[model samples]
Each structure stands twice: as structure tokens, then as C-alpha cells.
Target: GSSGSSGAPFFEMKLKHYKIFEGMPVTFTCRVAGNPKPKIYWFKDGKQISPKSDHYTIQRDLDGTCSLHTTASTLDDDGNYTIMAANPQGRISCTGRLMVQAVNSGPSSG
Candidate 1:
């Protein structure tokens, strides 16, 4: 585990598939590191953010940690979510399907 200041840019700790429970607000993270540094771009299903996410997904981060949250969290956000990290190297893509589920999604052990 040695880094030469900047070399071989890449991403770490990615979500391949996920589930979003109804009535619970949550966030998804796509951690990264590199030389040029990457800009995080988030997508919902097939629709990408025009300029940026307004209220639903206001990206908040500390250091290189990238994550998004939906304050008005409902079942509507559940879909094929994708996040792209772009730098001088290339665009690194991470796709994670977010499925909305309630007690019905499980064995209903409430």
C-alpha cells in the first residue's frame, strides 16, 4: 500500500446493487482517488442530472468521499442508478440498481 503522490487513478468501495427501504432516507457512496481528481456525476435510471440535483439529491462530501441523499425519500427514487467519475484518465462508471421495498419485499417479519 504505497502511493507515489499521484499515479494510476481509480475508484474504491463501489455499490453494484442495493435496495432502498420505503420511509427511510439513505445515501449511496462512490469513493475515489487519483491525480487529476474526478468529478462525480449521478444518474437516475436513464435520466442524468441536467445542471445538478436540486433538492432531491444534493451531493454532500468530505475529503474524496462522494455520496447522495434524497430528503423527500419515497419509492419513486428506486431505479437503475449510475454514477460516473471523470478525470483526465477517463470516465469510471459504477452502476447500482436501487430497488424500493417495504415489508412486503421481505418475509414480513414485523
Candidate 2:
């Protein structure tokens, strides 16, 4: 006999490496699925980041998905961005690498 079938939290869509120019905006989104609804958290460079920020935005979707948006990123923004999902069952995490390049004086790619 078993209590029930419980699945560990997992990221359906994980973040990928991204390269962007300074003063540009970027977004990272991911979907998660699990037996119990999971709570999402975000981190930067191994440090936890507050969900509230004027420069950074955190969003959670009703469909088991979440995202982080960065407005006008700078060189300091270059680091490992991590997303963590946790519940009473278990916790899972994924990381995305962000590479920021210096602004180009030449023409931009639009």
C-alpha cells in the first residue's frame, strides 16, 4: 500500500545562455510541473535576489510558469541567473548564464 503518488518538482522549460549589450533589456522564463504546486524563487550569482525591484521584475503565471525581467542591464548584471522551485515534496533549480557586452558606438542590430 502507498500513501499516494508524488512527483518531484522539475523545470519544464529552463533558462539558456544569453548575450546582450549594455543598457538592453532581457527576460528569462521557465515552466515547472509537480504533484504539489511549487513556490518559485530567483537568484543571481549564487546570491538570493529579492522578488521586488524596480530594475528587475519577477512574474508568476497561473499555468505553472515564471519569469524574470531585467531592465537596462549593465556589466554588473553579467553573472549566473538561477531559478528555484520548491515545495513540501522537494526542491529543484536551474541556472542561466548572462553575458553583457559593452555598448557599441557603431550601428546597432535592430
| Clash number for each model | 0, 0
> Which parts of model 1 have CA positions greater than 4 angstroms off?
1-8, 50-54, 60-62, 102-110
**What's the true lDDT of residue 40 in model 1?**
70
Write the residue-wise lDDT of candidate 1 on 30-109 in tens digits.
67776566677778867876446565565546677767776645566777677777677555677777766663343575
Model 2 misplaced stretches (Cα beyond 4 Å): 1-5, 104-110
TM-score of each: 0.68, 0.82
Model 2 — TM-score against the truth? 0.82
Error of 2 at 54 (Å): 0.6
The numbered model that scores best in lDDT is 2
